[PDB]
Design a protein around this ligand. Structure first.
Ligand SMILES: O=CCCCC[C@@H]1SC[C@@H]2NC(=O)N[C@@H]21
Ligand SMILES: O=CCCCC[C@@H]1SC[C@@H]2NC(=O)N[C@@H]21
Ligand SMILES: O=CCCCC[C@@H]1SC[C@@H]2NC(=O)N[C@@H]21
Lengths: 687, 687, 294
């Protein structure tokens, strides 16, 4: 088969010129017209770093070298969890690669760089249309000397549901083979059985196991008894007994006050004198720099930081602030400040390309109300964008109050992905329906809760500390199936060879083990990603502005496909609509005229949505959210029981089962499969 | 005379609809369409505060009460220097008054609130067209219980030049009569003779004298010998001997590292156990919260903070962060966090009205390069806007480097207004002319330096620590007059009664002592302010959006002129241009049609700019900056000596004397009085 | 685009009608028939052969009934008998059988409806042209003496900033300047601003062009004899039948008023009216479905 990359790229550029951005843009901001300036890099291999120790001496040798290090070690999250928080994980492989050689040379003493895990895996395929594994591989070649770190969920890997154990093990194996070094293993509820599986999978792969305790509450507040200092110490003892190489405290919201830092970290050091202590926080409160200095003074070996232009607010504390504040003390990081400035300078320019995703569109600074609401950095940005998309943007203060009430109703569980989303959906549901906590708990048998909340209460994410809230769980679930113990333990092993064969039969002989694991964790996303890249080619070759907005008429630019293969492209014109609903886009490619035809949907728009459900008529079932009808479970003339499934709506990437509020006969169904509904659109009538 | 306020306001609104904003807008951002939500205030008088102690027991009683306070006292800079830093001092009296009753009730324990210092005085009259004294009086009425604080320059009051001593004394007297309580007395060079005059003037008025030492350098760095710990201790001893009630450390740039905080503040406490210590910083580095916590732990009694939405970056540290971090410690501020949140929320909304002036248009976060460049918060924002206006915006990195070089060339003087501006002009001049420091020092006899640099070298701002840089000063000044000692000491007393009579003759019998002092300090600004308010009336009654952008067609709004006198105004239409170059604007006012005639310069605005100076022809004198010709000192046929004044240009609010580079005969003058010149426009020819 | 075919059909229509003199209104009668023939793709022969089945225009029917007098040589037979069927025929002079109009009763009706300024000229104008005269009085009651305006102002109105003079009576001139037109208010009106004799005056006038929005669903299948389409664009004046009514062939079904001519739509078949798709005052396009017959 002849490769047609250049034409596929021109087809993408022509598609963006006719139809607009293929990635959903949350705010009316434009990318910077200027590409970021890459700082000068020395000619040669980078200096030896902590990875060279890890490769020579293994995970235990690396952990001893970290503990024995004189000073505060630093780790870079800019690559992942700094943008996850600030720009909705939209930073692309293109921009990461440009600065990677500078990082390798000037930051060779970093403990690790956290460029992988969390939301980056799904987001790369679904929204950036790039392979997360190729990003890892390319970056690994660029940074041969710094350990790569990922955020791993213990029994779910990087996915949103539980997987069979053999998928989690095979994912950690293939991640290590592809150059992942450190696995930060956490659970969204600190549910030890999920963490132990992820630790065993990462350790069996030959990775550095970093067991991460998610922090919530306040250990310095004696009124907060559920998440006390004793809770954290007891969980640390179980994770150390399970053979963690490094112990992490993951403060996903920025709740660690300097006094709580001092108390928790000194207690952990006194208990575990030889174990490396890694502290992660967010600067959401504007106190994260002070919190990390207090951790370092209390005997933390490592702290998470971001590049200064990618720090603060819902991100990590500033790298330059920590380096400057520790300079000339026993905690000196030995990082030259000039190198931090050049690094932040590049990201300041690069962040300008992502203005369309920047959290500063909605949040101008850190906010201390995080000590009340306990909303994690990445959840705050997402919950605001969701509230605005649902017409609740003016009520976002009510949504934050309802988030506290929803956390309590759910039982004050730790709030990190996906538990932070479960609390967020419940909070939006309460505000949308005008319901206080007491009303929502009283009516729990009558209300149709968000799927996530239902799946949580069923046990699909593990068991929360202190157990599930009763009688609230029993009222919501009724007769719905309950998962006891670890949800992955009852799943049959996935046949990865059968899946590989299915993928080869579909996409041809170029299917890799990484493709099989991507399909195993994210089947619909991976299928869409392969179909999209089959149509549009290697979009990672485009600069971020051209990827997001396409070229302007008469704009000229270069695209490097491979070393020594540059495309000189100029956009010339877009035609009027032809009789086939297509517009012809004209380009110059390497001094030659080229034309591609792209269909325009925005050229003509005309839908109609008549149905409406009277709020006072119990038999009229309205759509509980804007969404697409996936499935219709009933027909006209069918008898239905109270709580019986009627239809399935798919909105905001969540199947919601619409259930009957009464017993009766379905008089009429007003909806069809694949129909798009607005809120309160009449689904069906019951008599 | 019949009052015509409503018509004057409609004339302003019609003027803004036809001609655009009367205040210069630096960035293409629009004010928020929504006014800020004012939090609920209790009905009654506010609780007793520190002012009640000051009024009962005098300045020494107040200082003892501050020292004896258990915990860390907090002061609010949001009213001034929080916006001075973030929004170019553009916050108006309208928005300050709306939140003032909430501040009085919920923050009654503040040490002080600092709203009258520095630029607010000039900016209120020149750009907001409001009386700074009326702001002070109104705010005092709404906040009877919290001490008001101002930033006072010692021998210059709030002005930009030195004044006769009787003007500085009379200013402090009338400021105290109008309800100013605390005078933060500083000098831009820490020049003790200027500080002593300001301390004596504030003390003689019956104010609380707070002597403020401006911080530069690093006391924790043993390589920095000029501004050592011994320098600060020696100056503190002289200011304590001079009878300061409170000692302030003013870190105008955010240079105080936590280690330097600990060392400086403990040394000051150990030497002065009974003296209140007040620490001011900026969060420019992102370390300001950690710096203020270190000061409080080292025995500071008071720290400067801003409301959370008005904190960080070039502003003060976050109030909510300091309150949260000190909670339940011996340093607890006793401020309820819920009250800080409600205060921050209002400001977030209010800051949205000032989006057109927000430093976030140019700086997205704090920057640690402040430890190298030492640029103060308000100077950073101004220097960037100036660099962009001069076409140097893409070179702002070169301007920051040249700022370090200019500081060294000038002798590493303290950098705060106006010395921070003097270094800024020199830095822009160096970058504009492509000069290194060595070239600028070598050519110092041939170059035409910025007036501010010349006036500094003459001694018009006082004497820098270590003296002026020689031979550089002697080369720049040549035969220009030098001021020895204190510049105000040689000025004859200003006849304030003669000035009052001149103002009564020109403006009528309503001239107040505040008007006389405003004219004495700022004659041209005050004259323009009186002429503008005579035309357009009380613009402080308009909300900030209507003040900046005017009303939209068909927009309806309310204007309260006085208690129980509301104007209901609706904008209806704007006509085409009449034969007199005017456009008729139609309003409804209290249900009645009203029409005003407003001119539109924008329509006919045309001009031509022919002159140009060949860079290679020494006899062709080009304009060194865009500016207006104020004065022409020479005619065609005149003999001119090298260095002789040729013309005076007035650009960026700075008279620049253009001087002859050679001896010769003026062949031709190409410019006229009031002519606007671009850069390099030919002024004259010399043979 | 078919005006050449219309001119040819005018010759054919004149012959079919009997080559009568062609002047108002007989020239219009030939013109309607010619347009009807071209619109329906009919030759003279086909139109004469199908004369019992076709719904001819009203002017042609009223001519054949004798309402304009008797043509030289008499009416064309059998064509007249086929078109008229059982329709009433006027013999002799049509005015001779009309009862005298009571002009004093009409004068009193006009005084009661328009006030005491009714003249003998107004009575005769109403007697000859009742609907036109009523509309003319209502229009001039609203807008005043439009004969005082120059033609350009009458047809197109003034431009913005245009100044002009209007003489109402000898020595009574009104200098008038148009100043502005506002946006649409919540009542569907736009405020127009004038200067009148140096004084600003404002009038609130409604705009229909602001939001016309109509829908036209009905259509008559040409092959379905029971589907009765509108024979022309027109307004429904009257509906003579209801759903469930038995109708005979040639029975009146509705009255359309288009081009200033009431056209009676008649049944092409005997049957039962299954459904009526139109309402009184409804505007129809050509071929819009009026009703169904089974
Ligand atoms: O729009 C759909 C969701 C996109 C991913 C959101 C990520 S999942 C990781 C992180 N945790 C959350 O609760 N949200 C973000
Ligand atoms: O545009 C002209 C200057 C406007 C005032 C600038 C103020 S003066 C106080 C502060 N210090 C500076 O250097 N700039 C600001
Ligand atoms: O638009 C409707 C008809 C307007 C009058 C037409 C006149 S009546 C006198 C003359 N004879 C005709 O056949 N037409 C014109």
């Amino acid at each position: 088969p002849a490769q047609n990359r250049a034409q596929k790229l021109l087809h993408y550029l022509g598609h963006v010129m006719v139809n607009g951005p293929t990635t959903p843009i949350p705010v009316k901001a434009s990318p910077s017209p200027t590409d970021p300036v890459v700082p000068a890099v020395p000619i040669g291999p980078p200096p030896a770093g902590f990875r060279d120790i890890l490769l020579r001496e293994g995970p235990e040798g690396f952990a001893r070298a970290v503990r024995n290090h004189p000073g505060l070690l630093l780790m870079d999250t800019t690559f992942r969890d700094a943008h996850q928080s600030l720009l909705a994980t939209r930073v692309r492989t293109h921009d990461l690669k440009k600065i990677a050689p500078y990082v390798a040379h000037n930051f060779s003493k970093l403990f690790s760089m956290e460029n992988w895990g969390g939301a980056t895996f799904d987001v790369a395929m679904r929204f950036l249309y790039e392979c997360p594994w190729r990003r890892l591989q390319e970056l690994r070649e660029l940074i041969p000397n710094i350990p790569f770190q990922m955020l791993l969920r213990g029994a779910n890997a990087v996915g949103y549901t539980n997987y069979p154990d053999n998928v989690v093990f095979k994912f950690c194996e293939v991640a290590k083979e592809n150059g992942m070094d450190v696995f930060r293993v956490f659970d969204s509820l600190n549910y030890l059985p999920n963490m132990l599986l992820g630790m065993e999978a990462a350790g069996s792969a030959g990775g550095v196991v970093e067991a991460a305790i998610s922090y919530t509450g306040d250990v310095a507040d004696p009124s907060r008894t559920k998440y006390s200092l004793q809770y954290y110490m007891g969980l640390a003892e179980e994770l150390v007994r399970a053979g963690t190489h490094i112990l992490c405290i993951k403060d996903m919201a920025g709740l660690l006050k300097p006094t709580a830092c001092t108390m928790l970290v000194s207690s952990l050091r006194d208990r575990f004198p030889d174990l490396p202590l890694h502290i992660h926080t967010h600067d959401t409160s504007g106190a994260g720099v002070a919190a990390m200095l207090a951790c370092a003074q209390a005997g933390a070996d490592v702290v998470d930081v971001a590049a200064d232009s990618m720090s603060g607010m819902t991100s990590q504390p500033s790298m330059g602030a920590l380096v400057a504040c520790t300079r000339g003390t026993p905690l000196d990081t030995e990082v030259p400040m000039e190198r931090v400035f050049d690094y932040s300078e590049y990201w300041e320019g690069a962040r300008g390309l992502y203005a369309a995703f920047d959290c500063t569109a909605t949040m101008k600074s850190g906010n201390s109300d995080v000590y009340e609401n306990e909303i994690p950095g990445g959840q705050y940005t997402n919950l605001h964008f969701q509230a605005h998309s649902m017409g609740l943007g003016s009520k976002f203060k009510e949504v934050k109050k309802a988030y506290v009430e929803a956390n309590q109703m759910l039982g004050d569980l730790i709030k990190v992905t996906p538990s932070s989303k479960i609390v967020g959906d419940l909070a939006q549901f309460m505000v949308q329906n005008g319901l206080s906590r007491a009303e929502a708990e009283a009516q729990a048998e009558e209300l149709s809760f968000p799927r996530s909340v239902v799946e949580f209460l069923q046990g699909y994410i593990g068991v929360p500390h202190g157990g599930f809230p009763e009688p609230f769980r029993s009222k919501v679930l009724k007769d719905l199936p309950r998962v006891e113990g670890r949800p992955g333990a009852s799943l049959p092993p996935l046949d990865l060879q059968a899946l590989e064969k299915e993928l080869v039969d579909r996409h041809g002989e170029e299917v890799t083990p990484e493709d099989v694991l991507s399909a195993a964790m994210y089947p619909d996303v991976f299928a869409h990603f392969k179909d999209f890249t089959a149509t549009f080619g290697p979009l990672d070759s485009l600069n971020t502005r051209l990827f997001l907005q396409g070229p302007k008429i008469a704009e000229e630019f270069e695209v490097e496909l491979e070393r020594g293969k540059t495309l000189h492209i100029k956009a010339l014109a877009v035609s009027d609509l032809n009789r086939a609903g297509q517009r012809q886009v004209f380009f110059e490619l390497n001094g030659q005229l080229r034309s591609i035809l792209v269909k325009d949907t925005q050229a003509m728009k005309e839908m109609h949505f008549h149905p409406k459900a009277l709020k006072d008529v119990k038999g009229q079932i309205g759509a509980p959210m804007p969404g697409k009808v996936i499935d219709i479970k009933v027909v006209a003339g069918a008898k239905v029981a109270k709580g019986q499934p009627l239809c399935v709506l798919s909105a905001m990437k969540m199947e919601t089962v619409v259930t009957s509020p009464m017993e009766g006969t379905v008089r009429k169904v007003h909806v069809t499969k694949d129909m798009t509904l607005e809120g309160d659109d009449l689904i069906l009538e019951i008599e």
